[PDB]
């Protein structure tokens, strides 16, 4: 879901610093490092560039740094280049709904682990769905799966998370009996489902993995399964 | 503001010390589920001291969810009251916890889940402890674990 | 000897229904169960090791739950090829014990005995194992037999070093287990044969030095009198 407000633009020249700031609620950023950030090239999947307010995973430059003050985050962006021309969102965890929430994102103008989804999927209204998410290279019950719908030209939302040890699932306000998220531990695969689709769930389905702290840490992301419904 | 489930895992290690030991039992699995490293190491003495006057299966039940921030030497201990840890809650340890444990150690803390090992041998916490072992240490299990 | 019970003893489904099989254990036992399925004129399989992790290859609709003295088989979706008898065996401690199993009416490794057939009561039978697809000379061994009408006994077991052997009360002294690791084979020695020693002898891998039977062979019958 989208609970955090950012501004939708920031712009600066190759070499510059800027900041790009989030806003939420004592429930959600005001929570303990409860603000991590993700960068999304187009075409590509989204990647975790800071997670608990200012920790980076190995392979992100000292370039990218965040700070919280208050309900407040922000990342910045010191030696700009033209690399770094992307959309960047802000997540954390609303402990009202107990699910991950992210902001709407922000368009940056410049002057072992893999998971495997189902391939794309053409569908009419009205019709069953079952799209699949498998992992490898590490132990599939230690780590929560999330899944990520954009619809095309709009931003992240997240659908639910499932602990794949005990199965035991939440899903977003929005998405609360609209779908179903399931796990087969014994086959490391991950599951997203639709009873009868309807037009507006033509989208991009993302599964990622990682940790409900640090404002939902998740480092590890699927290619991505397009699902087209006329 | 504190009836959320969430509530617990929101407050700093440092705001954590103030909980008393004695709410430890009314703590769920659920309201560890946002809680990092740093704040399993504040939750899990404050564990160990509510649930102490407990043995075995009973003890274990209640720990489990806290074992996280648990250090070696309680690994240990917990070896020899034959506990039969699964290998989930054995592969959500710490790697610093795990690693100077021995073979003979962790056949008791898993037991039967022992028979699982082999599909984790590539896997964060349990790859670590292999390439700290002797092979033929490895080779008594009876896994054909590889890379002592 | 641990008791080890199983309700129902027989039982009639159509495909589609959920079947519940309880095992029930004269002590406590922890978790150290396993749950096999056992099809018309073929060998056991693995199906449930530590009460209930699925072993690989085993579909979903299988679970297994409890711990203690009280342990549950669900089959979920019943399907035509889960027309068989489904054992529990405890491996908590020696001997290792079966249940009488429940009749249920509607592979990278090989594992090939021979050496079977029909011998004169006080005789002897040397029993051969070829395992292949596998690393032969890192697993422990063991051999199971069942009488021709009846359910699933442990008769000895060998660790992977071979330095220990373990042995049923009912064929210690008369029985010998060895492994060559050279011929990637397993024997049994049987002397002073008696008509209670008739069964098909099954060649059974351990998926650990202390674990369940996860690989079994098709067996070769031996026949006393």
């Not at chain 1, 990622?208 to 702290?213: K, T």
């Not at chain 2, 070896?79 to 008791?108: C, G, H, I, W, Y």
Request: with cysteine; net charge neutral; proline share 5%.
């Amino acid at each position: 879901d989208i609970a955090l407000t950012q501004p939708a633009s920031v712009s600066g020249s190759p070499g510059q610093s800027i900041t790009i700031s989030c806003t939420g609620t004592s429930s959600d950023i005001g929570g303990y490092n409860s603000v991590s950030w993700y960068q999304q090239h187009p075409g590509k999947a989204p990647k975790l560039m800071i997670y608990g307010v200012n920790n980076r995973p190995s392979g992100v430059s000292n370039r990218f740094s965040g700070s919280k003050s208050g309900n407040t985050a922000s990342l910045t962006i010191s030696g700009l280049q033209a690399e770094d021309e992307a959309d960047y969102y802000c997540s954390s965890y609303d402990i009202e709904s107990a699910t991950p929430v992210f902001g709407g994102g922000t368009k940056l103008t410049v002057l072992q682990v893999e998971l495997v989804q189902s391939g794309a999927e053409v569908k009419k209204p009205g019709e069953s769905l079952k799209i699949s998410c498998k992992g490898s290279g590490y132990s599939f019950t230690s780590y929560w799966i999330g899944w990520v719908r954009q619809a095309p030209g709009k931003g992240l939302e997240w659908m639910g998370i499932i602990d794949p040890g005990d199965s035991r699932t939440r899903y977003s306000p929005s998405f609360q009996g609209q779908v179903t998220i399931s796990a087969d531990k014994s086959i490391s695969t991950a599951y997203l489902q639709w009873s009868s689709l309807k037009a507006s769930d033509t989208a991009m389905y993302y599964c990622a993995r990682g940790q409900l702290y640090g404002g939902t840490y998740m480092d590890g992301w699927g290619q991505g399964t397009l699902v087209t419904v006329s | 503001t504190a009836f959320y489930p969430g509530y617990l895992c929101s407050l700093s290690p440092e705001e954590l010390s103030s909980v008393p030991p004695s709410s430890i039992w009314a703590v769920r699995p659920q309201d560890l589920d946002t809680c990092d490293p740093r704040q399993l190491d504040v939750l899990y003495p404050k564990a160990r001291l509510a649930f102490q006057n407990m043995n075995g299966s009973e003890y274990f039940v209640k720990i489990q969810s806290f074992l996280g921030g648990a250090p070696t030497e309680d690994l240990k201990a917990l070896s020899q009251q034959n506990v039969s840890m699964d290998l989930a809650t054995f592969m959500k340890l710490r790697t610093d916890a795990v690693l100077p444990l021995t073979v003979a150690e962790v056949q008791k803390l898993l037991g039967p889940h022992v028979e699982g090992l082999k599909a984790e041998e590539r896997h964060r916490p349990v790859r670590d402890w292999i390439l700290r072992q002797r092979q033929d240490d490895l080779d008594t299990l009876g896994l054909g674990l590889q890379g002592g | 000897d641990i008791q080890m019970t199983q309700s129902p003893s027989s039982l009639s489904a159509s495909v589609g229904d959920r079947v519940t099989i309880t095992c029930r254990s004269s002590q406590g036992i922890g978790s150290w169960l396993a749950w096999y399925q056992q099809k018309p004129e073929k060998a056991p399989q693995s199906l449930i090791y530590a009460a209930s992790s699925l072993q690989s290859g085993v579909p979903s609709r299988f679970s297994g739950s409890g711990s203690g003295t009280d342990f549950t088989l669900t089959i979920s979706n019943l399907q035509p090829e889960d027309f068989a008898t489904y054992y529990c065996q405890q491996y908590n401690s020696y001997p290792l014990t079966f249940g009488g199993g429940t009749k249920v009416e509607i592979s990278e490794v090989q594992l090939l005995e021979s050496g079977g057939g029909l011998v004169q009561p006080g005789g002897s039978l040397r029993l051969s194992c070829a395992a292949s697809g596998l690393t032969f000379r890192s697993y422990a061994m063991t051999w199971v037999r069942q009488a021709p009408g009846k359910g699933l006994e442990w008769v000895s077991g060998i660790s992977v070093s071979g330095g220990i052997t373990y042995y049923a009360d009912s064929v210690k002294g008369r029985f010998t287990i060895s492994r060559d690791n050279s011929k990637n084979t397993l024997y049994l020695q049987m002397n002073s044969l008696r008509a209670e020693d008739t069964a098909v002898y099954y060649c059974a891998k351990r998926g650990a030095a202390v674990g369940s039977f996860d690989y079994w062979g098709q067996g070769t019958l031996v026949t006393v009198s």
